[PDB]
Amino acid sequence: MPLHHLTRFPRLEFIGAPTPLEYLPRLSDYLGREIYIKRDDVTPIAMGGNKLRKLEFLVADALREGADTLITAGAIQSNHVRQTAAVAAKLGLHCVALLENPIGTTAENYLTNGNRLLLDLFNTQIEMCDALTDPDAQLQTLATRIEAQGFRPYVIPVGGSSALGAMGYVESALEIAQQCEEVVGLSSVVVASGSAGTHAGLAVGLEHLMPDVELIGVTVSRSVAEQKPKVIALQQAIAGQLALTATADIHLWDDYFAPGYGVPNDAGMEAVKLLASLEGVLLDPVYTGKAMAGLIDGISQKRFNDDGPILFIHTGGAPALFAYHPHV
Amino acid sequence: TRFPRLEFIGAPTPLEYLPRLSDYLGREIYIKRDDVTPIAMGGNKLRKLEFLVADALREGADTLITAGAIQSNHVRQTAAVAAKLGLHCVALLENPIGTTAENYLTNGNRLLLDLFNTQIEMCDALTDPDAQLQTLATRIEAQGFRPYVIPVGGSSALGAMGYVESALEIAQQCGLSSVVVASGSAGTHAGLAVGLEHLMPDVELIGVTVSRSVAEQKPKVIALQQAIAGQLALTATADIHLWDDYFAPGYGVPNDAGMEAVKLLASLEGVLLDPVYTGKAMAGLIDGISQKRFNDDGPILFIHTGGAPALFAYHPHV
Ligand SMILES: [Cl-]
């Protein structure tokens, strides 16, 4: 009932059915606590991912605006850029990508394999830059040039994280609440917290459908201090677009991303190895592996509110496994 | 329905209209998205494993053994399933193409095998898969384990039941004139053969071969077709159609027509095919239009059997 204004936003149909919400009996056995998993990694478009949920709203907005070109930005190994390019091809829209090498690697699989390989399969126009120091400003300059060629560009921010994009995860929260109804009482939810639209959309939805559930974001690029205002700003903007208040505090753990965004760490790689070997589930070195490492240590250090069921949001990211191998 | 089966997929996989590709080819093309399954990046082999692994549990196995190329999709899917169910996995692998390219040897499906904690046994060649798997099962059994052997490509009568099931989904989900599928170890072809004869008999089913000529491959598809039919107490009289022009110079080697099929589907539809199987099968479908090989001019159904992780293994070359 309280999420009905969500209906007013046009959206494309990229996913179809709700994504699986599954129990992880072997991980749970190992961790000594019930772990469930929301499989947003399993979507029908170009190897899937959370970003596709945001693109349903973003691209429908682009179509409504008469745009014929999608322009966005990210790392060379961005999942968002890859999903945006797959969607662009499918719809006969052009796609322009402003890419950066965030970790300064020269490893060939990072530079040419994984998500970056797929971009060429999608005929993505690639614009390289030294660094995304000011993505909104750099994306505009790029739009101006694209426009001078006669294209009608729609600019999507980094990670698809705008209030509109984040509606996709307000929607995901609705699925989660329905799937858990009379099946399991969730105590905590864990998701990776990057550009912040996924966290923020979950925050609004869960506040209204599942107010007792504790939502934890595991940062993948930022400290709590840098990250929290970004999540909050989106949270509030989302709530307003829906004519809702959002009074929930935002929780973030920043202990699991060192040495930095896009750099693998030992605990993140152990997390990937653990989910693959115990559950046949594929995480990634950049996002989900670090988030899972966060979940695992949280159980270990008693960081959660209690001993009840945890839901891990699988946001995707697996194509990056191939780019990060063998190293850097 | 007599055969016990594990639920790895659940919902029917999507069946879609490809309007951009259709527009380009001047023909109606549909796709069966069996590449979209929830387990370890998906694929057709998963449909087979629903039956083979159910069979394995019934016999109280604790270890699954199968064989394939280093970049085998089946082995990767078997290993993920094994990991999920708490079974050991032993894989017999060969290098079918004599490559030393780092990505073929260590990336793609092969990388996933390590993540899934697969035990790896290398052999010069899978000249006698049935017998080599048998030897492996013995040495594994003599170590205190209880092995269950899964054939190459998961292709046996039991395995192929997975594709009688897909045929039902196709029937439910569908003026279809033709169906195109890659024909390798043959369980998929033969499973769709049985299911489609009994549900869509007017539909022409074409297997595009990926490893063999029509002469070498037809008996394999037939043997399996007849076996599947017997097990379901049916008779299958429909003949097997195969095109073998699209796989040169051999199994697991990409060709230009297949790679350009991957490019066309990526750029037109945002769909990802692979260099070994579906790309080649799609090139056959396209050339089937070019040379008017199909029975008529009506809608074509392409079966996306999967294979995409091999894109990362085959890049940049060899
Ligand atoms: Cl334990």
Numbering used by the authors:
A (entry chain A): 1 to 328
B (entry chain B): 7 to 180, 185 to 328
Authors' account:
D-cysteine (D-Cys) moieties are found in firefly luciferin, semisynthetic cephalosporin MT141 and malformin A. D-cysteine desulfhydrase (DCyD) is suggested to take part in the catabolic degradation of D-Cys and D-Cys-containing toxic compounds. As in other PLP-dependent fold type II enzymes, the active site is situated in a large crevice between the two domains. StDCyD is specific for D-Cys and βCDA, and shows no activity with ACC, although it shares significant sequence identity with ACCDs.
Structures of two distinct crystal forms of recombinant StDCyD were determined by the molecular replacement method. Apart from the unliganded forms, structures of nine enzyme-ligand complexes have also been determined in crystal form I. In all the eleven structures of form I, besides the hexa-histidine tag, six residues at the N-terminus in chains B and C did not have well-defined electron density and hence have not been included in the final model. All the residues of A and D chains were in good electron density. In the form I native structure, 97.1% and 99.7% were in the most favored and allowed regions, respectively, of the Ramachandran plot. Electron density map of unliganded StDCyD revealed a significant patch of density with tetrahedral geometry at the active site that could be interpreted as a sulphate (in form I crystal structure) or a phosphate (in form II crystal structure). Form I crystals were obtained in a condition which had sulphate while conditions for obtaining form II had phosphate ions. These ions could be refined to reasonable B factors that were close to those of the surrounding atoms. The PLP phosphate is held by hydrogen bonding with main chain nitrogen atoms of residues Gly194, Ser195, Ala196, Gly197 and Thr198.
